[PDB]
């Protein structure tokens, strides 16, 4: 029975984190929580009550935070969360024009176009620095191939603009190619960013695991979320150094339904499922996952953002009810 | 008669240029094509000739020149070199739903105005220490105002109502921020145009769910690469949309998505629609509108027959069959 740091976040945050914990309870998941606010304080750091707690538990689950530096950026730097993982799979109860999406975007999360470095060269001339290093590219590439093996994925595509950015993207592509030659049971191709966008909105089923540097993954991960219904239903995890992982919602704070019981917990719930699979609790993952899918499929308790007329508590209750049926 | 430079390029470029010539002969178009080739060689002799020919003729029609990204950084994209030396600052594509090409979305009608010389395409990178590379995205006020001026004037002359600037100014506060700021400066002179802004991440999510909200879109170089290709996908793929590159004095026409097409070259399967439509934008630019309208209506009509469709739009027709059905509709 393991312990997980829980950061309910803001707005609808605490509501949906209570939903997740309640559903986890219905499922009898061997998981206990450790509620921890995080608020940027000076010394800019996260309150090390939580830093201590997460360094112990390793596993974390995080709600939406509101937007003076980015607190997601602080946690990113604090735990060295270098891999952003986004599995996008179509939801049978929620139909979009894309019904056969099963993609994992693996996004380098430390450098690239998010170096933090810009210069006003001269008034009206600005330079932004994209940073690619041999080490971060090697690590993200090793993570992608191990992820492909450890989740029985067959293909890994490196996405890049190395025709245009020969030295930066070309270095990233060189490291992927190097890991590809060592992990040859996972099949490897390379593809220009714009060809990936072009083909993605036409036939997303041709793609499996996608690994790319920071900005491309930032854009592509949201593109694929749009294929399957948006950020309200998209799980996400940031995997870091010292084994740490934090799984998170990427939707907004939604302060105006903040306490009106109309939030949608699906995304955080599916991130929690992702957490469970990361921890090895596959059975509890499968049951909670199926219960949420069946609820969405029904779908009498579709929350208002999924086109239904039903409060969060109804949606949450039914998932608990259904996961209780999977005995 | 006019003289136009033609760069066959690589992949499917040469074979499609031939079909362009055939259609021009059969339509009795008063245009002579002066060809310049660009080989695979690191030396810039050929690309320099092509630039100078385009300076002489001021109008070109080009295929895509292959960029081997395994060559050293010193060997730069010949497409980008030509674009930047001629200072063709506006890449303009018009993505519109084709009624005979049924995709997942209908009623798309987006004008994309992309900054075509600056940004992530400046070819500025270095290695400070071993295995630490920096690449320098450059945003300037003069080019950002230039592109925004094109986008607003285009919107107003076209009867469009809204301009949306696409950016990442929440992370690239100064670079993208300056780009936004120049858009806002221009917007002040076009108060009848609704001006909005959207983060590139969100833009892609909106494009694949409700692309009908967009009208005119303006953006720096890389974001335009991304958005051009999403939108081309939504309306049916790379074989359909023409692309224009405008400088103050020069104009170069090509397919919107700039694909070489090596894997389908010389198999008589490439869709010729985008290339023909670009050749019609060139004819329009030369003020030979009557020739443009004639070829454009034939090309759009052959698209209404699902049987003339090439495989990129779900059909099984070859390139030469499509060219025949274009020539058949050209009546004189
Ligand atoms: N005129 C056209 N008609 C049909 N398909 C096209 C056309 N132009 C480009 N494509 C397709 O668009 C895609 C991207 O173009 P790109 O130049 O990268 O192709 P490629 O490298 O030949 O593709 P592949 O990965 O299949 O070898 C390819 O699938 C190509 O076949
Ligand atoms: Mg994003
Ligand atoms: Mg190309």
Numbering used by the authors:
A (entry chain A): 4 to 46, 51 to 74, 80 to 339
B (entry chain B): 15 to 346
Give the article text.
However, we were able to grow crystals of the αγ heterodimer with the active site bound with Mg2+ and the allosteric site bound with Mg2+, CIT and ATP from a crystallization solution containing CIT and a relatively low concentration of ATP (2 mM). This led to the determination of the structure of the αMgγMg+CIT+ATP heterodimer. In the αMgγMg+CIT+ATP structure, there is ATP bound to the ADP binding site of the allosteric site, which stabilizes CIT binding through Mg2+-mediated interactions and leads the enzyme to adopt an active conformation. This provides the structural basis for why the enzyme can be activated by low concentrations of ATP. Structural analysis shows that ATP occupies the ADP binding site, and particularly the adenine and α-phosphate of ATP make very similar interactions with the surrounding residues as those of ADP. , the β- and γ-phosphates of ATP are oriented away from the Mg2+-binding site and make different interactions with the enzyme due to potential steric conflicts with the surrounding residues. Meanwhile, a water molecule occupies the position of the β-phosphate of ADP and mediates the interaction between the Mg2+ and the α-phosphate of ATP. As a result, the interaction between ATP and Mg2+ is mediated via a water molecule instead of the direct interaction between ADP and Mg2+, suggesting that the stabilization of the CIT and Mg2+ binding by ATP is weaker than the stabilization by ADP. Structural comparisons with the previously reported αγ structures show that the αMgγMg+CIT+ATP and αMg+ATPγMg+CIT+ATP structures are more similar to the active αMgγMg+CIT+ADP structure (RMSD of 0.26 Å and 0.56 Å for about 650 Cα atoms, respectively) than the inactive αMgγ structure (RMSD of 1.0 Å and 1.1 Å for about 650 Cα atoms, respectively). In the αMgγMg+CIT+ATP structure, there is Mg2+ bound at the active site, and in the αMg+ATPγMg+CIT+ATP structure, there are both Mg2+ and ATP bound at the active site.
